Design a protein around this ligand. Structure first.
Ligand SMILES: C[C@]12CC[C@H](OS(N)(=O)=O)CC1=CC[C@@H]1[C@@H]2CC[C@]2(C)C(=O)CC[C@@H]12
Ligand SMILES: [Zn+2]
Length: 257
């Protein structure tokens, strides 16, 4: 099965998922001097006041914090988007060392990690139908750098001991994702894809310019997770990031001057 190793990592994915070599793959390098300021872009509307987290899951590639998406609660709108996108889950990508881990890069800079808040377009009714559409998902990407602790991340860090291995899940109610947002909602945006198989070209990417800071101790606890299941040879869950893919016929737009 696909993963992040020498024999099953990103350079292999195209064999099972030929769209890996497609025209709108993610992530990409964001060249800040080439990105065009677009005065037509609206402020991002992030409405997470009523978000209902349910559960956290180790899926063998990352951990997902899951939300109840059965009502119009936690929604993303405005920015580059038409209509309303509902939060279904967030997860991270991170490195073995602080010098790598992000999927997007900024002028080739790699951050220590990257947070993805995944939302689906309510006009397609469910997640699975939305990913079959070119405007099906909106993923809000947020860089992590190592410095000061993020107090709003600590509830996530403290539950990871209970989901060390693939297939382990835990009850994870009342988690407020507003505690993971930077001050500024200035962003870059471009059309792209999921960054894991099935690599579907269904995403409007919205990548915030301002990173959040997390402590070395917080990211070290991400790196204690395991890719393997309980009672299998230990493989630390690190370097679960896809490298930058070719930009091809795409424009990255900036919300800010
Ligand atoms: C969970 C995952 C993969 C991991 C992606 O990660 S990322 N990095 O692109 O946000 C987000 C994502 C979106 C759609 C989802 C798909 C897995 C297979 C699913 C469940 C089918 C129908 C919907 C599909
Ligand atoms: Zn992701």
């Amino acid at each position: 099965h696909w993963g992040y190793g020498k024999h099953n990592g990103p350079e292999h994915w195209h064999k099972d998922f030929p769209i890996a070599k497609g025209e709108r793959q993610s992530p990409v390098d964001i060249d800040t001097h080439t990105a065009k300021y677009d005065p037509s872009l609206k402020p991002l509307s992030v409405s997470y006041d009523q978000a209902t987290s349910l559960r956290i899951l180790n899926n063998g590639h990352a951990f997902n914090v899951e939300f109840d998406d059965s009502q119009d609660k936690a929604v993303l709108k405005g920015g580059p988007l038409d209509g309303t996108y509902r939060l279904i889950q967030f997860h991270f990508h991170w490195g073995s060392l602080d010098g790598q881990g992000s999927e997007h890069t900024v002028d080739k800079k790699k951050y220590a990690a990257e947070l993805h808040l995944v939302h689906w377009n309510t006009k397609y009714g469910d997640f699975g139908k939305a990913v079959q559409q070119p405007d099906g998902l909106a993923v809000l990407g947020i860089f992590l750098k190592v410095g000061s602790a993020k107090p709003g991340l600590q509830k996530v860090v403290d539950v990871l001991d209970s989901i060390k291995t693939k297939g382990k899940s835990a009850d994870f109610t009342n988690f407020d994702p507003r505690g993971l947002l930077p001050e500024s909602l200035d962003y870059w945006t471009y059309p792209g894809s999921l960054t894991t198989p099935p690599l579907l070209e269904c995403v409007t990417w919205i990548v915030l310019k301002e990173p959040i800071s997390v402590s070395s101790e917080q990211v070290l606890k991400f790196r204690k997770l395991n890719f393997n299941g309980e009672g299998e040879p230990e493989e630390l869950m690190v370097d679960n990031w896809r490298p930058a893919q070719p930009l091809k016929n795409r424009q990255i737009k900036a919300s800010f001057k």
